[PDB]
Amino acid sequence: SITAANVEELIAKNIAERFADDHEVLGLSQHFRREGYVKLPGLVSPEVFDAVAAETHQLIDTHQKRIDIRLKETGDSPRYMSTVGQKAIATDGSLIPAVYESTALKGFLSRLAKEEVMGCPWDEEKYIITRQHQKGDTHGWHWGDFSFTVIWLIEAPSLEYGGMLQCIPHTDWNKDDPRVEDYLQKHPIRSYGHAKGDLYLLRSDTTLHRTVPLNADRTRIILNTCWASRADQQKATTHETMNAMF
Predict the structure, then answer these.
(1) Which parts of the sequence bind succinate (predicted)?
(2) CA distance 115 to 228
């Protein structure tokens, strides 16, 4: 049994075992910086992942709310999904709030980012859950308010049914003039596939990204743990997108 009291040890020993090659870590850091994204297999042990997955499933069953909205601040891109907010996770969750404070996890991500990865200054963006479960469900084109986002693939169908991540790095989010279509025309799109058990890190504030809409009745669930930079702390932020989805 994995608990909030013994999880930080299990995270640190897995990181010490999985990421011993400094040359491998250097390539992962360079991938993250170049592409705004890097896949991180084995970021946590399978046993730690399965425990977090179980807690996420319990939180979905007791708190998920359906949304079907389009966000003007991201070019009217859709958010067709069911979701669980941070306040619900901080109240009835245990492993997820503890993992978010993991010094070992934030220390490894700091190696990749080449700067201090620390807690989000807005509590309601620390961790969220989304569940795509209908044909057409999608997390539309958007940026993030903060810098370092880790996505946990709790459940996912085969990629012929949707869910593919697409990214354009080294962009910016202008909430008054997002110009999403202009970004797609001016830059190539990189697509990344993921399956259950995968974790990936994404520079959300400068990487325009979305998930390809589900084309069938399938289930795709992710946990979003979002950390921030030092400049993010004193950053004047309005949270209109999070207020609408959560």
Answers:
(1) 142, 200, 220, 224
(2) 10
Q: Per the domain annotation, does 107 fall within a domain?
A: yes
Contact 124, 242 (CB under 8 A): yes
Q: Is residue 1 part of a domain?
A: no
Coil, helix or strand for 234? coil
Annotated binding residue at 179?
no
| Total number of domains in the chain | 1
Is residue 224 annotated as involved in ligand binding?
A: yes
Q: How many degrees, rounded to 5, is the angle at CA 45 between CA 150 and CA 198?
A: 45
Radius of gyration of the chain (CA): 17
Q: What angle do CA 138, 99, 106 make, to 5 degrees?
A: 95
Q: Is 100 marked as binding a ligand?
A: no
* The total number of residues written for the chain in this structure: 246
Residue 217 lies inside a defined structural domain of this protein? yes
Residue 220 among known ligand-binding residues = yes
CATH number, domain of 53, equals 2.60.120.620
Does residue 140 fall inside a structural domain? Answer: yes
Which domain does 108 fall in, by range?
6-245
